[PDB]
Amino acid sequence: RYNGLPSMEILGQAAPGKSTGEAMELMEQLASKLPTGVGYDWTGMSYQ
């Protein structure tokens, strides 16, 4: 659970050459095309 709601923590990183910002921007785009009632958020190192 994350912020009092059911969640599933997903780890990952940017491929050789590409930055963290580009990788996160793609995850946000992929997350937007998911089923109704499925949100997302950034935690730990990604929050900073």
Place this chain on the structure above:
Amino acid sequence: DGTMTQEDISDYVAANMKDAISRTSGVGDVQLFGSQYAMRIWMNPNEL
């Protein structure tokens, strides 16, 4: 759109909004103008 009643709106706020708002930055106490849904067993003394 008149699909949700007063009692129904109160539940959604209490169940899906209040907890997150109460943990929001700079928020002290949060007062619900309504009540969250509970399983109501309305007893009949004649049938008992």
